[PDB]
Design an enzyme around this catalytic site. Structure first.
Site, PDB file in Angstrom:
ATOM      1  N   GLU A  47      47.604  41.626  40.205  1.00  0.00           N
ATOM      2  CA  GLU A  47      47.099  40.752  41.264  1.00  0.00           C
ATOM      3  C   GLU A  47      48.093  40.563  42.391  1.00  0.00           C
ATOM      4  OE1 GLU A  47      45.018  36.748  40.096  1.00  0.00           O
ATOM      5  OE2 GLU A  47      43.789  38.471  39.470  1.00  0.00           O
ATOM      6  N   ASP A  63      42.476  33.056  50.866  1.00  0.00           N
ATOM      7  CA  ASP A  63      41.629  33.868  49.984  1.00  0.00           C
ATOM      8  C   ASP A  63      40.724  34.804  50.788  1.00  0.00           C
ATOM      9  OD1 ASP A  63      41.963  33.731  47.159  1.00  0.00           O
ATOM     10  OD2 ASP A  63      40.972  31.769  47.029  1.00  0.00           O
ATOM     11  N   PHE A 116      40.797  36.138  35.101  1.00  0.00           N
ATOM     12  CA  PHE A 116      41.548  35.896  36.342  1.00  0.00           C
ATOM     13  C   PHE A 116      40.901  36.659  37.519  1.00  0.00           C
ATOM     14  CE2 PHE A 116      45.048  33.653  34.392  1.00  0.00           C
ATOM     15  CZ  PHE A 116      45.872  33.207  35.398  1.00  0.00           C
ATOM     16  N   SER A 158      30.255  45.834  25.754  1.00  0.00           N
ATOM     17  CA  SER A 158      31.689  46.100  25.671  1.00  0.00           C
ATOM     18  C   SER A 158      32.425  45.001  24.889  1.00  0.00           C
ATOM     19  CB  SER A 158      32.285  46.272  27.063  1.00  0.00           C
ATOM     20  OG  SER A 158      31.944  47.536  27.606  1.00  0.00           O
ATOM     21  N   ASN A 216      33.209  52.643  27.339  1.00  0.00           N
ATOM     22  CA  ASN A 216      32.143  51.779  27.867  1.00  0.00           C
ATOM     23  C   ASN A 216      32.563  50.948  29.083  1.00  0.00           C
ATOM     24  OD1 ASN A 216      29.270  51.620  26.823  1.00  0.00           O
ATOM     25  ND2 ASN A 216      29.659  49.427  27.026  1.00  0.00           N
TER      26      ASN A 216
END
Ligand SMILES: *C[C@@H](Cn1ccnc1)C(=O)NC[C@@H](NC(=O)[C@H](Cc1nc2ccc(C(C)C)cc2s1)NC(=O)CC)C1CCCCC1
Length: 356
Positions: A16, A25, A106, A119, A134
């Site tokens: 990140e 953001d 997150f 999954s 997958n």
């Protein structure tokens, strides 16, 4: 809370990114830490100052970013456990794989992760290979290919190998450029080598475009953190990979919003640390790079400055020159002398007009 962190901080710092200054953001800092929903920076700095315990003025240390990150991990874990779709899978998973699940939370939130029903079931069942194949078929794999492949490898192996091996590759590559007199930075020789390896001249437009993408602070300086963060964020682990990203960076600059951002960045990168303005000769050298083919009066502007200004260029003047170049008629007949341009641009138009 000490009974309940080491690997997860470095895992998300890689995926990140870590920002030490308040950004948008929504007001954010560190590894995606939300400060407030308020649009007020005064509110955002207030929340940050209260959370840290000092007058930060929106700037924090890596350790402060870690204190905040641990709070977000603990909150993420509470959220997952209250989710009926996520709690069984989380409970069944070992420590390493729980970190990969928190990583997904997150990135896309609980609802985003809960959507991976088939999954998540394979993971709960410890069908690691079937789950890895997958998760790679999803849109998640295309939107963030480098991040997703690393998280998928974490689920496939139950090891930190994807993060450990990227750090090894970048650290080996770093060693080729580091300064012998200073291990924590890339010196003059190192920057020259980096540019040679890319088959680029260090004073070229392509290298200035790369500095913009690396968010580099200053010309002729290149810190280890700039190299590490830049290469990871760009998804590059070699010179060949960075070389292959240059046409994409070039294409971005055809969009005016991106070009404006790159143009304004150039001023901050070009200037000497400790100086607020840009020395004239330097400003002219960078203007010839960034305004080449965008400003009809570029040479006459340089001549004007070298003969009538002969002084430093302030940031506002640098910024406004782009707006001048875009709107100015080839005969200057549309110039608003009674307008709000810097005096320096009014003086340029006065100087240039009799010369047609
Ligand atoms: C080295 C510096 C000495 N100096 C003179 C006055 N103040 C300081 C210098 O020569 N500065 C002006 C040069 N700039 C360059 O040659 C730079 C060199 C680079 N710095 C970096 C930093 C980071 C990176 C990474 C890979 C992101 C790369 C490079 S290359 N080059 C640029 O700024 C790109 C254009 C020149 C003056 C003539 C006009 C071109 C720049």
């Amino acid at each position: 809370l000490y009974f309940q962190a080491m690997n997860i901080f470095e895992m998300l710092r890689i995926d990140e990114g870590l920002r030490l200054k308040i950004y948008k953001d929504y007001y954010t800092i560190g590894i995606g830490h939300l400060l407030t929903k308020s649009p007020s920076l005064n509110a955002a700095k207030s929340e940050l100052d209260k959370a840290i315990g000092r007058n930060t003025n929106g700037v924090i240390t890596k350790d402060e970013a870690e204190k905040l990150f641990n709070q977000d991990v603990d909150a993420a874990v509470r959220g997952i456990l209250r989710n009926a779709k996520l709690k069984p899978v989380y409970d069944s998973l070992d420590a390493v794989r729980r970190a990969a699940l928190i990583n997904m939370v997150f990135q896309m939130g609980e609802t985003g992760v809960a959507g991976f029903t088939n999954s998540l079931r394979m993971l709960q069942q410890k069908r690691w290979a079937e789950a890895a194949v997958n998760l790679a078929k999803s849109r998640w794999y295309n939107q963030t290919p480098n991040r997703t492949k690393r998280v998928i490898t974490t689920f496939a192996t139950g090891t930190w190998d994807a993060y450990k091996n990227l750090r090894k590759k970048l650290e080996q590559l770093y060693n080729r450029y580091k300064d012998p007199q200073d291990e924590n930075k890339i010196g003059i020789d190192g920057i020259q080598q980096f540019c040679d390896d890319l088959a680029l001249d260090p004073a070229s437009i392509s290298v200035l475009i790369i500095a913009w993408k690396f968010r580099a602070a200053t010309q002729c300086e290149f810190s280890k953190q700039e190299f590490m963060d830049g290469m990871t964020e760009l998804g590059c682990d070699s010179i060949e990979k960075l070389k292959a990203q240059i046409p994409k960076m070039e294409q971005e600059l055809k969009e005016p919003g991106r070009f404006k951002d790159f143009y304004q960045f150039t001023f901050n990168f070009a200037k000497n640390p400790g100086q607020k303005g840009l020395d004239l000769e330097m400003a002219i050298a960078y203007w010839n790079l960034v305004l080449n083919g965008r400003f009809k009066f570029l040479d006459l502007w340089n001549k004007f400055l070298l003969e009538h200004h002969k002084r430093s260029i302030p940031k506002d003047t640098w910024n406004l020159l782009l707006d001048f170049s875009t709107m100015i008629a080839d005969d200057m007949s549309n110039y608003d002398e009674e307008g709000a341009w810097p005096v320096l641009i009014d003086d340029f138009v006065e100087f240039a007009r009799p010369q047609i």
